Ligand binder design. Structure first.
Ligand SMILES: CCCCCCCC/C=C\CCCCCCCC(=O)O
Length: 135
């Protein structure tokens, strides 16, 4: 099936330069501190033309469901209403674009074996967050 390497659960293992990106996004001090501490678990399932990503943490539990190439409305974990689309780059890579009125966030997720690397870019600032596959 499609995106089969994404399927299952993933837990954040490492984060590099993430404060630079939320700072740039205008995220509140207090939510930024939570964002620099919590280690979420992310679950992907693929059900038809649709992928679902569930994010679970002590802060918030959050889900989104999408068709590739199809714009949709999203509220981010920090509370911003954004227009997003997720594009399929390959069976092992997808790119999510989130457009708020102040900024645009590009989130690339690429699976390589037991690592999902998530690259987050807002203008000229980039963060990389590595997730390990669970079980
Ligand atoms: C990883 C998101 C869950 C963290 C919740 C705490 C609040 C985070 C603040 C701003 C998030 C906006 C930046 C985009 C996050 C996606 C990155 C990812 O999947 O690891």
């Amino acid at each position: 099936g499609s995106m089969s390497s994404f399927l299952g659960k993933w837990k954040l293992s490492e984060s590099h330069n993430f404060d630079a990106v939320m700072s740039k996004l205008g995220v509140s001090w207090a939510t930024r501190q939570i964002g620099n501490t919590v280690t979420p678990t992310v679950t992907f399932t693929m059900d038809g033309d649709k992928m679902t990503m569930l994010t679970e943490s002590t802060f918030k539990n959050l889900s989104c469901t999408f068709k590739f190439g199809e714009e949709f409305d999203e509220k981010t974990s920090d509370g911003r209403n954004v227009k997003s689309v997720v594009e399929k780059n390959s069976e092992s890579k997808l790119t999510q674009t989130q457009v708020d009125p102040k900024n645009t966030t590009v989130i690339v997720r690429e699976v390589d074996g037991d690592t999902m690397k998530t690259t987050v870019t807002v203008g000229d600032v980039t963060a990389i967050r590595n997730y390990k596959r669970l079980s």
